[PDB]
Design a protein around this ligand. Structure first.
Ligand SMILES: *[C@@H](C(=O)O)[C@H](O)C(=O)N[C@@H](CC(C)C)C(=O)NCCCCNC(N)=[NH2+]
Ligand SMILES: *[C@@H](C(=O)O)[C@H](O)C(=O)N[C@@H](CC(C)C)C(=O)NCCCCNC(N)=[NH2+]
Ligand SMILES: OC[C@H]1O[C@@H](O)[C@H](O)[C@@H](O)[C@H]1O
Ligand SMILES: OC[C@H]1O[C@@H](O)[C@H](O)[C@@H](O)[C@H]1O
Ligand SMILES: [Ca+2]
Ligand SMILES: [Ca+2]
Ligand SMILES: [Ca+2]
Ligand SMILES: [Ca+2]
Lengths: 269, 275
């Protein structure tokens, strides 16, 4: 559901398996949900006015814009440089997406994405929003409710809004990192290094792939311990259940639900 | 001075400006020689990782760069026997008794000697100082750096830190800067959240770790590269930190956005450190 400030898929309610992306001025286009190209991610940021936001392509950096400010039925919805204009402010209410400037609506036509006056005989102006982000407070609270913490656990965070990546994305970053073909070596490249390097790899991949600012990629680092010893590893929350912390071994790219029995004493994200 | 387990330059006390390094040249039938090296340059193969082997004053002496062990060729006690770098064997001709300084082969009782120059084993010499060496410690233990960190003036009351490794190499500024230059951080634009101070500091920290992995074939130590989050009344910032070779008690701060060093951490006071 739409919940204000966040990163979302914007899906048509009118036809199945259809969501918004930006062409490669670029048009806002329909996109199949069988694929997950990064230009389907929309960073929705409040502007102060009730239920009013900018809607920004995270990948391309462009802003959803009603072309030429035109109120005319069938005016293109495009991606544009930021202008401060009212044709880049969108009233999202319950869901429809209404231009502040014209009062025309983002509409799926025929298909193409356009501005149109209110339509009441079909659902072509109705949209569903799947939240893909967590605030820093969201993740902090999840982290603290995690059952795999040592009693002295302390955590620190760096950013106020996070994209939650898919496993496909995390694993692609990990494959590209070269860590899986890096031999473990005592001190010089041991668990702390794998976990630190991998967190950095995720950050670099974000920088390479997203032209928008105002959000970070969630990639947690933990130090933890158990009776046999102590270990460094990574962690995440997942899209299907944001309240669950999942663990990741940067030496071999595997996930664990219970952190290999380690109880974290330090968390960074 | 020699202080047991650690990483050191081993310099001749017989002639100035001269320390030990390992040759980069070898062949099927020739091991790399331990050689003399000018202290006007700082090639990584001048670094020696000296590790106790559980006998009084006895150590392996490993080239941090090449991974090779200082080895008395052929176990020979004969004067003028080559001192080489060899794969680890566990043999007594790779074990060295270091006493107050001289370096004596456990196998032969002969001493590492600067001859003419070349580096050879030789019986005890009393009419010159060619068997005398100085050791400059370039490493700190985890406990050493923690103490240093706790005694510095740049921490908040609530500061917590977390230690990663046991034995650290302390890098030079030239080395830190060369890693930083190679990272491309200096030409990466700052962008809020997506690539901001936290990312510069974390990514640089990882850059140092990869540089260590890629340039040192020995194991059993890490490179010191601290991460700090700190604040002051005007906002919060992430940055890196180190200790100085000239004074291991001095914490120096490093800005990974532009490669600059600061003695005062730009007035930030740390709440979090990782090293
Ligand atoms: C982890 C691995 O490669 O599996 C590697 O053994 C390692 O570094 N282990 C650690 C702790 C990780 C850094 C979490 C360890 O067991 N000890 C060294 C770190 C210092 C411990 N903390 C203090 N204050 N002594
Ligand atoms: C630092 C910079 O680029 O100079 C950048 O502003 C930044 O990341 N600042 C941080 C703190 C550093 C990581 C030390 C920051 O203040 N981020 C805000 C985090 C949001 C905290 N939220 C909650 N819920 N506690
Ligand atoms: O060409 C499309 C552009 O048209 C301009 O008139 C407008 O100010 C922009 O926000 C963008 O819509
Ligand atoms: O050729 C040099 C080698 O000779 C062998 O006899 C010895 O076992 C090795 O330690 C190395 O010294
Ligand atoms: Ca940040
Ligand atoms: Ca390490
Ligand atoms: Ca370690
Ligand atoms: Ca960040």
């Amino acid at each position: 559901s739409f919940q204000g400030h966040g990163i979302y898929y914007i899906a048509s309610a009118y036809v199945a398996n259809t969501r918004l992306a930006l062409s490669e001025s670029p048009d806002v286009i329909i996109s199949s949900d069988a694929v997950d190209p990064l230009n389907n991610l929309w960073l929705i940021e409040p502007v102060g006015e009730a239920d009013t936001y900018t809607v920004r392509n995270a990948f391309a950096g462009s802003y959803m814009d009603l072309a030429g400010h035109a109120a005319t039925d069938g005016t293109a919805i495009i991606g544009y440089r930021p202008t401060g204009g009212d044709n880049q402010k969108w009233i999202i209410s319950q869901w429809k997406i209404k231009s502040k400037e014209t009062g025309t609506f983002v509409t799926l036509l025929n298909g193409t994405v356009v501005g149109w006056q209110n339509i009441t005989n079909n659902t072509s102006q109705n949209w569903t929003f799947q939240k893909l982000s967590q605030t820093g407070a969201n993740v902090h609270a999840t982290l603290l409710a995690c059952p795999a913490l040592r009693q002295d656990f302390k955590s620190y965070l760096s950013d106020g809004l996070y994209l939650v990546l898919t496993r496909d994305q995390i694993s692609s970053i990990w494959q590209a990192s070269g860590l899986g073909s890096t031999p473990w070596r005592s001190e010089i490249f041991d668990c702390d290094d794998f976990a630190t390097v991998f967190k950095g790899a995720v950050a670099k991949w974000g920088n390479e792939n997203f032209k928008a600012n105002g959000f970070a990629l969630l990639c947690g680092l933990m130090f933890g311990s158990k009776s046999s010893g102590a270990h460094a590893y990574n962690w995440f929350v997942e899209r299907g259940n944001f309240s669950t912390v999942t663990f990741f071994e940067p030496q071999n790219g595997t996930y664990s639900a219970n952190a290999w029995d380690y109880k974290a004493y330090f968390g960074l994200f």
